[PDB]
Amino acid sequence: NQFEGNDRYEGYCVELAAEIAKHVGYSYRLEIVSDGKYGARDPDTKAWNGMVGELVYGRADVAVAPLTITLVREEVIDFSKPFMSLGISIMIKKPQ
Amino acid sequence: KSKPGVFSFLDPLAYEIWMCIVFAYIGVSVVLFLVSRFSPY
Amino acid sequence: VVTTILESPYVMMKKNHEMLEGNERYEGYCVDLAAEIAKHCGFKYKLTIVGDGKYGARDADTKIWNGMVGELVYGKADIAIAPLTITLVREEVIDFSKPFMSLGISIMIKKPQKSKPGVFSFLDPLAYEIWMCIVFAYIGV
Amino acid sequence: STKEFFRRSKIAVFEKMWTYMKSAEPSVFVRTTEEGMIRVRKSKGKYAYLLESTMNEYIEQRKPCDTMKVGGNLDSKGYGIATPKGSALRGPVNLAVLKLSEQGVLDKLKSKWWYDKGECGSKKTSALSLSNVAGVFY
Amino acid sequence: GCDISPRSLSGRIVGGVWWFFTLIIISSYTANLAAFLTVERMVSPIESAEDLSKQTEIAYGTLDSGSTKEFFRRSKIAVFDKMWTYMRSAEPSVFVRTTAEGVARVRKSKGKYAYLLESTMNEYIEQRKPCDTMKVGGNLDSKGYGIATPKGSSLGTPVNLAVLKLSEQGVLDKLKNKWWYDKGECGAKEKTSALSL
Amino acid sequence: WFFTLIIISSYTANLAAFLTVERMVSPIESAEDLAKQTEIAYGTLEAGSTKEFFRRSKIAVFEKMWTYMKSAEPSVFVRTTEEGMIRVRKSKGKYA
Numbered sequence: 265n266q267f268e269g270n271d272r273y274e275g276y277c278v279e280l281a282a283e284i285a286k287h288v289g290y291s292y293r294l295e296i297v298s299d300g301k302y303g304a305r306d307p308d309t310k311a312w313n314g315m316v317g318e319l320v321y322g323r324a325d326v327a328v329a330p331l332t333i334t335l336v337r338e339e340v341i342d343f344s345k346p347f348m349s350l351g352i353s354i355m356i357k358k359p360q
Numbered sequence: 361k362s363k364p365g366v367f368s369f370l371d372p373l374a375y376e377i378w379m380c381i382v383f384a385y386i387g388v389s390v391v392l393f394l395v396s397r398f399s400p401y
Numbered sequence: 402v403v404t405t406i407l408e409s410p411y412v413m414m415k416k417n418h419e420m421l422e423g424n425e426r427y428e429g430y431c432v433d434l435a436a437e438i439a440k441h442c443g444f445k446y447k448l449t450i451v452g453d454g455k456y457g458a459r460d461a462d463t464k465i466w467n468g469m470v471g472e473l474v475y476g477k478a479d480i481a482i483a484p485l486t487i488t489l490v491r492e493e494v495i496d497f498s499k500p501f502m503s504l505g506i507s508i509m510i511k512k513p514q515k516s517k518p519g520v521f522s523f524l525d526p527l528a529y530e531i532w533m534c535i536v537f538a539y540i541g542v
Numbered sequence: 543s544t545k546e547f548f549r550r551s552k553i554a555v556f557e558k559m560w561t562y563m564k565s566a567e568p569s570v571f572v573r574t575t576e577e578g579m580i581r582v583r584k585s586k587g588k589y590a591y592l593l594e595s596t597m598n599e600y601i602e603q604r605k606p607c608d609t610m611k612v613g614g615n616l617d618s619k620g621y622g623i624a625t626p627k628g629s630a631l632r633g634p635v636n637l638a639v640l641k642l643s644e645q646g647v648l649d650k651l652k653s654k655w656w657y658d659k660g661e662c663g664s665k666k667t668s669a670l671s672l673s674n675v676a677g678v679f680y
Numbered sequence: 681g682c683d684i685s686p687r688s689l690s691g692r693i694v695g696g697v698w699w700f701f702t703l704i705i706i707s708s709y710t711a712n713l714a715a716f717l718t719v720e721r722m723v724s725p726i727e728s729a730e731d732l733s734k735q736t737e738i739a740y741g742t743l744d745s746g747s748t749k750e751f752f753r754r755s756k757i758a759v760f761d762k763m764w765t766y767m768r769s770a771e772p773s774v775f776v777r778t779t780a781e782g783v784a785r786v787r788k789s790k791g792k793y794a795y796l797l798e799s800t801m802n803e804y805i806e807q808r809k810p811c812d813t814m815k816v817g818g819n820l821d822s823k824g825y826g827i828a829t830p831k832g833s834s835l836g837t838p839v840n841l842a843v844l845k846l847s848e849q850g851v852l853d854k855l856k857n858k859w860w861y862d863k864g865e866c867g868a869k870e871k872t873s874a875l876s877l
Numbered sequence: 878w879f880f881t882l883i884i885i886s887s888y889t890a891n892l893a894a895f896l897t898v899e900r901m902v903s904p905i906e907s908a909e910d911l912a913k914q915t916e917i918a919y920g921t922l923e924a925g926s927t928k929e930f931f932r933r934s935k936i937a938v939f940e941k942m943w944t945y946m947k948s949a950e951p952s953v954f955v956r957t958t959e960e961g962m963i964r965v966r967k968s969k970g971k972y973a
């Protein structure tokens with residue numbers, strides 16, 4: 265409540281967006297996907313549910329978040345070269 | 361059916377170790393004899 | 402007019418490649434990849450080689466690209482299918498795909514061997530602190 | 543995506559995993575990631591979770607720091623920056639991302655928000671230790 | 681044995697506890713030695729990169745005039761800054777002129793040289809005869825190998841979608857297994873030996 | 878006395894090692910045991926139904942065998958069955 269606008273948000277993606285806009289040279293206003301879910305289409309309704317929707321429907325101009333790169337999205341969206349490579353991994357109890 | 365050799369009980373230690381064990385036994389015994397029976401005390 | 406480079410195990414000449422005529426003598430990873438790419442796109446391809454650097458780069462004076470990048474820029478080939486590294490300078494003059502193989506820097510060492518036994522390796526079963534405590538417990542007793 | 547990746551896998555090892563998967567755990571599967579983390583923490587090493595490496599590291603650096611990531615990455619994917627089709631922010635954004643990666647910015651941010659803010663730390667001999675035979679000395 | 685044993689209760693207490701101590705310690709020594717001789721365990725001195733920076737006995741260098749050296753030079757992480765300092769203040773030249781030169785330098789030496797390279801070639805070599813090398817630790821950088829195309833070719837979107845489809849279904853992983861691990865010489869028990877002098 | 882202690886303890890320990898290892902030894906009893914290990918080479922007739930059966934196999938274990946098969950034995954394969962029997966007899970357990 266103390267801070268308003270982008271100043272209230274802190275994290276990796278925020279600083280990444282700062283640097284990206286600095287290099288491109290544009291001002292940005294953050295927000296959050298109300299659905300709170302990453303993009304995905306309804307199999308029957310054929311409608312996207314998430315930030316992909318906020319992009320392809322003109323609501324948003326860019327998405328800066330952990331968007332997994334997939335074929336379904338790459339057809340209706342223009343991604344960028346991965347800023348973070350990633351993979352499936354194994355999590356175990358730390359041996360005391 | 362591998363027939364275990366007689367003197368396979370020596371296999372845990374190499375031949376050289378047994379040889380030098382014998383040598384050290386002789387040396388120890390001689391040095392003990394000497395350092396015990398030299399000084400006319 | 403695809404392109405490739407002999408760096409193994411991406412492109413290599415199959416055993417007895419004299420018998421093979423063309424596009425079948427080559428073997429490796431990049432070749433199977435190009436096969437599947439052509440299958441999913443349809444076009445027909447003839448694997449080739451370039452040399453003259455074996456990869457992309459630029460001469461600051463000549464300002465002429467060399468290798469796969471050089472030939473793609475100048476029309477000598479259609480696409481390059483090879484372990485070609487994604488980089489800023491190249492993306493400014495060509496267009497890449499999403500990485501088909503991600504990697505990074507790593508450390509190579511010689512495999513640890515059975516170390517030659519050290520003099521006083523007969524103390525190894527117990528830590529040095531145990532041995533010193535043994536000595537001083539002997540003294541104290 | 544992990545369940546689909548295992549189900550639709552043509553590899554031997556992950557095929558065996560899937561054959562094991564869907565067994566009578568009763569439920570090896572889970573509905574929420576926090577649920578999986580809690581289940582692994584409660585289990586005395588009897589459960590292993592499969593998840594994205596980034597979250598595994600973040601959790602490993604979270605209090606109480608009672609879990610760890612082990613092994614390499616089974617799959618290989620990436621996170622990207624999205625723009626709508628036919629936008630003017632395509633080339634510049636990709637160029638910026640690549641320039642940042644070469645400059646080392648992204649790795650520094652990774653280290654900062656994963657390790658320089660972790661509750662836990664940063665990072666052998668089979669010889670018998672004095673703790674094994676302490677009662678003798680006492 | 682003993683040519684004398686204590687007769688008083690206090691001396692006998694001392695002797696008894698000493699006897700217990702001796703029994704336990706000798707048993708422990710013999711048992712742990714049996715463990716050592718039964719199970720061979722070779723520990724790699726290095727399991728990360730910080731371990732490599734702290735160590736000075738082991739030397740490490742990249743290929744001279746390459747992208748890896750350019751990475752270490754312009755670095756901002758502390759560990760890689762330390763490595764760059766070392767490599768710039770190293771005698772003789774840790775650097776190398778060719779990949780095979782680095783591989784040979786690693787193989788000829790015995791745990792003295794560690795070579796910093798790409799993960800893929802390292803994994804390949806760890807499967808070559810002689811199988812006298814291994815890769816340690818994680819990866820210090822992120823990179824990718826990408827299919828290229830001239831600016832304006834109609835082949836961009838199709839190849840992007842093709843690689844994405846192949847990755848999703850799992851073709852590329854299978855090909856890597858085929859050309860790195862399979863088609864690989866050494867894959868992934870020896871009777872116990874008598875003790876030597 | 879110190880020398881004696883060390884030597885007797887070493888003898889007992891190495892004898893225990895010998896017997897323990899001799900007790901671990903699980904011989905080959907199935908296709909899997911042969912498949913995973915590689916200290917022993919296995920090959921069938923060059924031309925025959927066995928080579929075709931392994932080549933055209935959709936099973937995991939025999940797929941692994943075939944992957945191993947056609948390797949640099951130099952020649953795990955053989956031309957005559959008597960040749961295979963003689964080769965196994967000559968090999969000191971190094972061929973199956």
Ligand SMILES: NS(=O)(=O)c1cccc2c1c([N+](=O)[O-])cc1[nH]c(=O)c(=O)[nH]c12
Binds near residue numbers: 302303543575597
């Ligand atoms: N676009 S995405 O691909 O939707 C996706 C994007 C970003 C993070 C994800 C994620 C998914 N997922 O698959 O559902 C699962 C998941 N699970 C975790 O535990 C975590 O930390 N992050 C994630």
Ligand SMILES: NS(=O)(=O)c1cccc2c1c([N+](=O)[O-])cc1[nH]c(=O)c(=O)[nH]c12
Binds near residue numbers: 484779801
């Ligand atoms: N585009 S590239 O960047 O040209 C390049 C592409 C592909 C493989 C490379 C490589 C370079 N390099 O840096 O020069 C060095 C190098 N060194 C090795 O030891 C190895 O196995 N593979 C490589």
